[PDB]
Paper text:
In eukaryotes, ATP synthases are found in the inner mitochondrial membrane. The type III ATP synthase was detected in ciliates where it induces tubulation of the cristae membranes. In this study, we present the cryo-EM structures of the type III ATP synthase dimer and tetramer with associated lipids from the model organism [name] in complex with the natural inhibitor IF1.
Refinement into a 2.7-Å resolution allowed for construction of a of the ATP synthase dimer. The ~2 MDa complex comprises 81 protein subunits, 9 of which were not previously reported, and assigned directly from our cryo-EM density map. The specific subunits at the altered interacting surface stably tie the two monomers together in parallel to each other, with little induction of membrane curvature. The total surface area buried between the monomers exceeds 16,000 Å2, which is at least four times more than for the characterized other types. Homotypic subunit-b contacts also involve bound cardiolipins, whereas subunit-f interface involves  protein contacts only. Consequently, the type III ATP synthase dimer structure contains by far the most extensive dimer interface observed in any reported ATP synthase dimer.
Author numbering:
A (entry chain k): 1 to 120
B (entry chain a): 249 to 446
C (entry chain H2), H (entry chain Q2), I (entry chain P2), J (entry chain I2), K (entry chain J2): 1 to 75
D (entry chain g2): 201 to 250
E (entry chain d2): 24 to 157
F (entry chain e): 27 to 443
G (entry chain e2): 2 to 69
The structure:
């Protein structure tokens, strides 16, 4: 007679795999939008819940961020080395132009940069 | 810590270890709480998402997980205040004025006893200057008591009390209620004894 | 180099801005407590327990700023 | 006449006639007396005259 | 749906002073929080007046009424149809105040939670009536 | 400065019957004349659902606030309004009697009563549409639903199995092309069969009471029937839904051609609400045949009773009864009506332009543009097979159209031109 | 205070006006004094069980309260 | 170059402005919660729920800026 | 060049100013929603919906500001 | 050193900002205490203690700033 | 060096900010005291004492500020 002493007020939830099945995922959460495409539908279809998906992407994110950070260290010069060489000579061209037009006192200090707009 | 003075070469040995024990085990309490939640731990913190993009929510979930810990670690700045405020008082007391002019029959004749010692402070020293040093003393210690007594409460009332009030709870629903009905049947079995008024 | 240092310290001063607003937000919070208390003092405990909770969150951000403050000053 | 319990639950819905000088929690119970005493006081006179 | 300019009704369980009047121009009374003023087009609202003074301006002089009274307590309701009704326990004029006749045997009170407010109110009205005479 | 005109009058010079399009014209009629005339408006329903964004609404690309609009908003503040339907119309006397009974006179009458929805044509339909769980769906939301009910968005999602029926009533009906969602459901249901969410033994057939989908445009209807077969959808013509049993999920269909009725089990039923002709327009001798107003195809003026006009859906016009078609029908009525009050001629002619999007995919569409003679413009059936071009046009209509119907009712933004 | 007198104590509004005028009944004319009078009888109704006389009218006699 | 970096570290300091308004904004929300509670303390549940929810959106903007800060500081 | 570049990143920081006011504006909105609820909690769903709606409009400005930021940062 | 020291002392001036907001928070707090006292004077001592109590939370930020001020002024 | 002296005198000016907020805080304090007195004039003396007391706390920030100013001006 254990069911005689069972309280039906525990039926407020249907817990299965640490998840309540009586959750309105159609009106709340990432699953509410019905304009999701083939990829997002197949993604939720696998996990059935946003709480489980967000949990896995939490760790998969560090994996991707820690990887692209490595590829950008190992590789990366393939696409930005030109902008670095560009800014290198550019940083020398403007420096060379500064020494030409700048007031240097008896010591090598630009004490009057506000002499004109070009000096600033 | 007085009773631990001879147990080592550092009187504060047991205290320097405990501050570390106190830090690591408080640091693991939130970590074990997320492990207890499971893979849904992010819904326990932030709730349901808003956007269909997992990359978008991934950023809002990292904040909630950071905020989850900042609520804890940011409270250790309270311990920094209690220490800094406690050290400033020790520095004022350890450096407080004590001279041969307050000693009875001093033999330290080489410590300013046989020298001409004037100053450029206010006169009526014991009526003007010396009380002011005691006035500041009372401020340093009252400011210390109010700080250490207050930061002590706020630390435990936020790290443990409030932190667990936000992420944990107790259910009002029950699954079994067989005590209520057995007590009723038991009370009818003892009806005759109660009639005698025990 | 020396300039960014002068800026690093300058930013550290800005951290005292929430320290200012936190004081104002307190006077406002405690003002509501008094009026709320004078309105219905029988329910003090509830009104009160919610007060400190709010305040805890208030100065928490204040400490948070100091964190970023020393960070940018040394990172 | 409706009882006190039914009157209060009905009076809380009052929104067209503002009650802020005395707050609604006090006004609801006060005007209840007026509502009840008015009928009683009027009934006694009619019966006493009869 | 709507009513004319205004109508006021001042009634007392033992006498009716104004079943319906339109000559009055303004009404002012003292509530628990502060003094209010009810006149034409006053929106709907309820009020409860403690035993304070009630002054009402008359465009044309009304017989037997002075326009300045001290009530022992009453209810006020401003209906939706631009109508206000004042119902007080009793009413009298200031000229019949007969001041200095207070505290003539009813000073004794009981030390309880209810007797506390009882004495509190009694003292509040005494200070009020004394000022009302001025 | 200006004072609101009076509504408690015995007669006016202009009278609008309708708030969806009859309100947009009035608000446009005043600004064209600068308020030299006192016009009255009388609608029947308080709410105007934006059916032009019905499909983005079912996709929850449009919140319920941006899809539900009151009739008062379409009407301006200067013009009075009253939610009482006309009980009868007497053109010989130039007056209009309301349900209450107050006789009102007029000099020019504009009718925008459109097609009135009649849920009673299908027994048990409304009661099943209002149930928050039953799989019976419709084209509009009942007025009993609150802001927390989103059953409309579960037609495509909750189709795990069973027999599905998309029913189309007998022409004339409202929502010819703006309520055809059998191309988005196919793409969404093609995915469900891929990962098993939708059982493989399911049936979806389009029950079209009429013989053709688009009556006044052969190019569009030929494209639809061509695309439906390419997708693999089945259709049944001359069959109209008749009754719906909410207990056992039985749908009673009837083939008007053969008069043979059948009973079919359903698990996901969608139907476009059927219309119904109003008798007060037939008793006055204004409609013709089907029940639409008998008006000129160019000037929109009624054949007889030259002081009366008609536009919207109630008008008998050889074109698609869309909303953009209404944008060009209000500019004509405000012109001609402006000329009748001044005795001038009618120089405004309606070309029969109508523009409505056809959603060919979950996030793709193509515009069905055609004039009176079914001739399409540069936009007619372009980028129909999907692509980047159709994808952008879809986002422009879903995320940028419902926010525009607020201005149309206010007056900040007029028609396209 | 009329509001707290009812909240923290079960004092009805009518009883408050009575306690209010209680201290000024003599100041008011005799016309009003005769009005401020309550005297009746309450019986718990068996043949002769109880006979209660309600004459105080200020304490927990006519308008009971929580404080009393 | 060096100055652009000096401005970057400065923009990072500006992030402590919402931190200030968040404290004041928090004191206000909890100030009303007290009064709102004293007016009708029977509904602690609903009011309290709305408090933290509102607080969430408030702090959400706080950390959003902090994220924006480190972004501009390294990007 | 670098000067204009310095102003670009500088404006990018200024976008955190509405973020501060958005935080304060949120506390005020919910503080009223709380008081508005304690007054008449019968309209939870109504008041609640009107609340989040207004909040949604606020994020429009917030996102609008950030959008303006990156735009001016690269254009 | 001397260059950074100049901005150090300038930052120390920033600590006078909470000194301003703390004053305003005080003026507002005692205002609520006074008006609230009038509405329910029966609990005067209760309100009074909470008033000064709230004020203690104000000088908290004050001393915190000055502490942080002299700190960065020398650290 | 010379600039360090210039920023010192500049900071000394910053002390006038609490002087400004203290004025507004005082007006607000007396503003509530007026309305508070009208609500319950029976305790005018109590309200009055609390009014000046709060103001005394305001001048504390003032003396605290100028004190810091004159200090940083000479230290
Ligand atoms: C570039 C530098 C790279 C550096 C190196 C990087 C190295 C990386 C290595 C690793 C690879 C990355 C791995 C990622 C996965 C990691 C795990 C994970 O995250 O989980 C899965 C995760 C799933 O994503 P999700 O968040 O769940 O999806 C969102 C929704 O749920 C989706 O909702 P939905 O499914 O319902 O519908 C989605 C979509 C509907 O989706 C579709 O319909 C598309 C489906 C089409 C399928 C077609 C199939 C074709 C067949 C294949 C080929 C056949 C071959 C044919 C024959 C060829 C013969 C040769 O609907 C929409 O309308 C979407 C919104 C509109 C689009 C917004 C895009 C904004 C981008 C702006 C950039 C503009 C640049 C233009 C430049 C163009 C020219 C260069 O995958 C990813 O996150 C992908 C990575 C995203 C990272 C973004 C970071 C960058 C942010 C933008 C930067 C902008 C550019 C800046 C540089 C510009 C320089 C010019
Ligand atoms: C320098 C280091 C710094 C980092 C320090 C980090 C240290 C932190 C230590 C934390 C503790 C780690 C220990 C984890 C224990 C896990 C044990 C376990 O496996 O139990 C499972 C357990 C989940 O089980 P459950 O929750 O009890 O119930 C599951 C339900 O019943 C299931 O219901 P359902 O069936 O509906 O769910 C569906 C499914 C959904 O799954 C999915 O989402 C699907 C994903 C997609 C899969 C790919 C699909 C591909 C499809 C291809 C299809 C192709 C077909 C094409 C067509 C073919 C045609 C033929 O869910 C699952 O089954 C997956 C759940 C298990 C995921 C495990 C994730 C944790 C991995 C951690 C890796 C780290 C390892 C190193 C640890 C280091 C420790 C020293 O895992 C957890 O609970 C994880 C809890 C984590 C909480 C701790 C978080 C700590 C955060 C640390 C970062 C702090 C940041 C802030 C720091 C601030 C400054 C200090
Ligand atoms: C027909 C007319 C005939 C008569 C006409 C002529 C009348 C006479 C005119 C006077 C002529 C000038 C007098 C020159 C001779 C002075 C000889 C002498 O022994 O002076 C030594 C004495 C010490 O100087 P020193 O030894 O040469 O050292 C040089 C430097 O000080 C060293 O520099 P430092 O910075 O290093 O020194 C620190 C500085 C520290 O800085 C300070 O000066 C401290 C100042 C803080 C207190 C200031 C407030 C005092 C008044 C408060 C009362 C206000 C009441 C009203 C409030 C209204 C608010 C609007 O000084 C001290 O520390 C002094 C400490 C010793 C005094 C403290 C203890 C005194 C005991 C008081 C108990 C009184 C109980 C009644 C007993 C009466 C009989 C004895 O000189 C003075 O203090 C001069 C006092 C001048 C009086 C000031 C006003 C007093 C007002 C009291 C009102 C209450 C009584 C009402 C009476 C009403 C009568 C009508
Ligand atoms: C309400 C009033 C405010 C309260 C004021 C309280 C403080 C009052 C002080 C009264 C002092 C009066 C007698 C002092 C005489 C003895 C000390 C003395 O003479 O000063 C010694 C000397 C100054 O001498 P010189 O500077 O060298 O001057 C030489 C000039 N040729 O000062 C001192 O040494 C300081 C005095 C000793 C400090 C001892 C500290 C005691 C600790 C007290 C804490 C009590 C703990 C309670 C538990
Ligand atoms: N997809 C659908 O099911 C659907 C339904 C209705 C409208 N619409 C859209 O609305 C556009 C224009 O709508 P419409 O103006 O042609 O008609 P309508 O649907 O907007 O209704 C006409 C207005 O007049 C009122 N009305 C009807 N009979 C009335 C009567 N006897 N008395 C008083 N008022 C009466 C109606 O309540 C309404 O306010 C259409 O082009 C169409 O796109 C679509």
């Amino acid at each position: 007679m254990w069911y005689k002493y069972f309280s039906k007020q525990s039926w407020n939830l249907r817990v299965w795999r640490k998840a309540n099945l009586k959750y309105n995922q159609d009106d709340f959460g990432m699953t509410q939008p019905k304009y999701i495409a083939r990829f997002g539908d197949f993604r939720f279809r696998l996990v059935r819940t946003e709480g489980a998906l967000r949990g896995c992407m939490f760790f998969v994110g560090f994996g991707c961020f820690s990887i692209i950070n490595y590829l950008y260290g190992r590789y990366g010069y393939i696409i930005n080395e030109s902008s670095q060489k560009r800014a290198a000579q550019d940083l020398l061209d403007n420096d060379m132009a500064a020494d030409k037009i700048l007031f240097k006192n008896r010591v090598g200090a630009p004490t009057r940069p506000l002499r004109s707009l070009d000096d600033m | 810590h007085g009773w631990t003075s001879m147990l080592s070469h550092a009187v504060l040995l047991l205290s320097c270890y405990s501050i570390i024990i106190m830090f690591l085990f408080i640091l693991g309490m939130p970590t074990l709480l997320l492990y207890d939640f499971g893979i849904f731990f992010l819904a326990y913190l932030k709730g349901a998402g808003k956007y269909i993009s997992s990359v978008a929510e991934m950023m809002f979930d990292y904040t909630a997980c950071l905020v989850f810990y900042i609520r804890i670690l940011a409270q250790w700045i309270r311990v920094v205040l209690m220490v800094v405020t406690f050290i400033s008082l020790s520095h004022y007391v350890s450096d407080f004025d004590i001279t041969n002019s307050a000693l009875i029959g001093s033999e330290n004749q080489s410590d300013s006893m046989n020298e001409l010692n004037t100053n450029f402070s206010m006169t009526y020293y014991i009526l003007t200057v010396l009380p002011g040093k005691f006035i500041y003393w009372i401020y340093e210690i009252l400011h210390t008591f109010f700080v250490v007594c207050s930061q002590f409460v706020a630390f435990f009332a936020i790290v443990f009390w409030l932190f667990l009030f936000l992420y944990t709870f107790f259910i009002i629903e029950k699954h079994e209620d067989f005590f209520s009905k057995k007590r009723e049947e038991r009370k009818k079995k003892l009806k005759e004894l109660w009639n005698l008024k025990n | 180099m020396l300039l960014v240092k002068a800026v690093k310290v300058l930013v550290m001063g800005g951290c005292m801005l929430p320290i200012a607003f936190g004081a104002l937000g307190t006077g406002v919070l405690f003002a509501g407590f008094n009026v709320a208390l004078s309105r219905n003092p029988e329910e003090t405990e509830s009104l009160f327990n919610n007060t400190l909770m709010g305040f805890a969150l208030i100065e928490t951000f204040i400490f948070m700023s100091i964190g970023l403050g020393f960070f940018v000053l040394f990172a | 006449l409706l009882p006190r319990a039914q009157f209060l639950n009905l009076f809380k819905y009052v929104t067209r006639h503002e009650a802020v000088e005395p707050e609604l929690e006090y006004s609801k119970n006060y005007f209840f007396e007026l509502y009840m005493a008015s009928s009683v006081y009027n009934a006694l006179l009619n019966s006493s005259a009869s | 749906t709507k009513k004319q300019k205004m109508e006021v009704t001042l009634r007392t369980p033992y006498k009716e002073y104004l079943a319906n009047f339109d000559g009055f121009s303004r009404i002012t009374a003292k509530t628990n929080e502060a003094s209010l003023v009810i006149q034409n087009k006053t929106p709907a609202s309820l009020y409860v007046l403690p035993p304070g003074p009630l002054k009402i301006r008359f465009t044309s002089e009304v017989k037997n009424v002075s326009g300045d009274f001290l009530h022992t307590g009453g209810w006020v309701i401003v209906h939706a149809d631009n109508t206000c009704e004042i119902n007080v326990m009793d009413l009298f004029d200031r000229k019949e105040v007969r001041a200095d006749q207070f505290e003539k045997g009813n000073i004794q009170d009981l030390d309880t939670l209810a007797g506390k407010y009882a004495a509190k109110s009694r003292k509040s009205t005494v200070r009020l009536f004394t000022k009302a005479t001025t | 400065k200006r004072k609101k005109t009076s509504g408690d009058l015995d007669n006016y010079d202009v009278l609008f019957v309708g708030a969806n399009l009859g309100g947009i014209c009035s608000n446009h009629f005043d600004k064209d004349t600068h308020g030299k005339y006192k016009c009255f408006v009388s609608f029947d329903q308080p709410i105007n659902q934006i059916y032009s964004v019905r499909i983005p609404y079912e996709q929850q690309r449009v919140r319920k606030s941006e899809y539900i609009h009151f009739s008062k908003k379409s009407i301006n503040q200067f013009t009075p309004s009253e939610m009482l339907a006309v009980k009868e119309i007497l053109p010989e006397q130039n007056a209009v009697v309301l349900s209450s009974g107050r006789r009102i006179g007029y000099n020019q009458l504009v009718l925008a009563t459109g097609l009135k929805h009649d849920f009673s044509q299908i027994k048990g339909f409304y009661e099943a549409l209002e149930h928050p769980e039953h799989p019976v769906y419709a084209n509009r939301d009942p007025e009993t639903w609150r802001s927390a009910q989103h059953k409309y968005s579960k037609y495509i999602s909750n189709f795990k199995s069973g027999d599905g029926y998309f029913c189309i009533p007998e022409y004339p009906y409202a929502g010819e092309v703006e309520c055809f969602n059998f191309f988005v459901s196919d793409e969404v249901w093609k995915w469900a069969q891929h990962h098993g969410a939708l059982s493989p033994k399911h049936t979806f057939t389009i029950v079209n009471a009429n013989e053709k989908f688009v009556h006044y445009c052969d190019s569009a209807d030929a494209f639809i029937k061509e695309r439906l077969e390419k997708r693999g959808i089945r259709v049944e013509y001359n069959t109209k839904l008749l009754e719906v049993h909410q207990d056992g999920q039985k749908a009673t269909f009837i083939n008007t051609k053969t008069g043979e009725k059948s009973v079919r089990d359903y698990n996901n039923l969608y139907s476009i609400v059927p219309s119904k002709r109003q008798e007060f327009l037939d008793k006055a001798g204004l409609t013709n045949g089907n029940g639409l107003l008998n008006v000129d195809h160019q000037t929109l003026q009624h054949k007889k009773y030259k002081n009366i006009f008609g536009l919207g859906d109630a008008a008998d016009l050889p074109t698609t009864k869309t909303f953009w078609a209404g944008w060009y029908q209000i500019a004509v009525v405000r012109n001609n009506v402006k000329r009748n009050l001044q005795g001038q001629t009618l120089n405004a002619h309606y070309d029969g332009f109508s523009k409505v999007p056809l959603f060919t995919g979950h996030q793709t569409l193509t515009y069905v543009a055609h004039s009176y003679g079914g001739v399409g413009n540069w936009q007619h059936l372009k980028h129909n097979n999907g692509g980047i071009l159709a994808w952008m046009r879809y986002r422009s209509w879903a995320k940028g159209m419902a926010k525009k119907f607020q201005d149309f009712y206010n007056g900040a933004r007029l028609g396209p031109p | 205070c009329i509001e707290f007198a009812f909240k923290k104590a079960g004092i009805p509004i009518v009883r408050n006006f009575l306690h209010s005028t209680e201290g000024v009944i003599y100041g008011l004319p005799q016309r009003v004094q005769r009005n401020l009078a309550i005297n009746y009888t309450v019986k718990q109704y068996k043949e002769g069980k109880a006979v209660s006389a309600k004459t105080i009218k200020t304490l927990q006699e006519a308008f009971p309260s929580k404080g009393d």
